[PDB]
Amino acid sequence: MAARRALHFVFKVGNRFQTARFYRDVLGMKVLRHEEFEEGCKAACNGPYDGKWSKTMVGFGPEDDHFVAELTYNYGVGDYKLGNDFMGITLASSQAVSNARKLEWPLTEVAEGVFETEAPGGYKFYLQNRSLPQSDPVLKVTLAVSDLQKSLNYWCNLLGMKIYEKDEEKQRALLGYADNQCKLELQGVKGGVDHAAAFGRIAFSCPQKELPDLEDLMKRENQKILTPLVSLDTPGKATVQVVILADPDGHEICFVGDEAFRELSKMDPEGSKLLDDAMAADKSDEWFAKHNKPKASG
């Protein structure tokens, strides 16, 4: 097998209704889990939405054997300016292509049988017009880098990702922890990496014993640690441990202990209905409207 496993990409969601509809009705993905969070407030809670946020996992199957989207919704935040850091997710589905066509959701053929589309927020998805394969339709996430060799030294020498493809001349590498996982594509881009406000995070699992040594290695090597090892709670569900890191271009990386994460990430059959009930009950847009002020921007 592999110790380390590609889990998900965090997407900052302005409009949850429109995001849920794109992921269900265009990509043909499903709700795996839905969790409503309340952080409370440092000072007096300003409005009924302060510290209130949701996490919805969407993808083609259980998180154990699929790479999925972590839809992060803050009830008080309505827009995120998208930079050039996240270049898209590529997946194989003629079903998604048909869905887009039937729903008149714009599609652009960028190579033979490959259709570029945009989720709400401008996040790019690349749809291969071929049959749903006999496993996870998600093939890769592509991230922009300023200095390819600097990025390979980080992602390969420090984090232990294998090189499936490397092209110095095209300034591109395809990395992965295993054949049966989502791959990470690094693409040298023009004009620097800009994270703006929509910047997400790529999550991997390792055995929990590796978390403190992963933190130490990054300290020793002078790499950025965004969040030292910490326990994160989810209402009515397992506590996991995370270290949050920053690659050489500042892409956020989450490492989480696999053994407890597998208890947290059980596919919840009620997830879809919990999302629909929370959306039916979300009057945040009407609240901000009556207060004559917008949701914050990322």
Residues at the contact surface with Cl ion, assessed by CB under 5 A: 30-31, 60-61, 135-136, 201, 203, 254, 272, 290
**CA distances (Å), 151 to each of 14, 177, 180, in order?**
30, 16, 23
* DSSP3 helix / strand / coil % (the chain, rounded to 5): 25, 40, 35
Quote the least distance from Cβ 288 to Mg ion, whole Å.
10
Q: Residue 180 has which token pair?
A: 């049966």
Nearer to Zn ion, 92 or 119 (CB): 92
Q: Name, in order, each residue with C-beta under 8 angstroms of 40's C-beta and a sequence gap of 6 or more.
A: 51
Chain position whose Cβ is nearest to Mg ion: 292
Interaction partner, residue 292 (Cl ion, Zn ion, Mg ion, none; CB < 5-8 Å by kind): Mg ion
63 contributes a contact to Zn ion by CB under 5 A: no
Closest CB to Cl ion among residues 111, 280: 280
Q: Which is nearer to Mg ion, 108 or 292 (CB)?
A: 292
CA 248 to each of CA 8, 149, 165: distance values in angstroms, whole numbers, following the listed order = 20, 11, 20
Between 203 and 214, CB nearer to Zn ion: 203
Chain gaps in the chain, named by the residue before each (C–N > 2.5 Å): none
Only one of the segments 89-97, 163-171, 180-188, 203-211 lies at the binding site for Zn ion (rule: CB under 5 A); that segment is 203-211
Name which of 6 and 148 has its Cβ closer to Zn ion: 6
Please tell me the number of Cα atoms within 13 Å of 120 on its side-chain side: 19
Rounded least distance, CB 7 to Zn ion, Å: 7
| Residue ranges in contact with Zn ion by CB under 5 A | 61, 70, 203
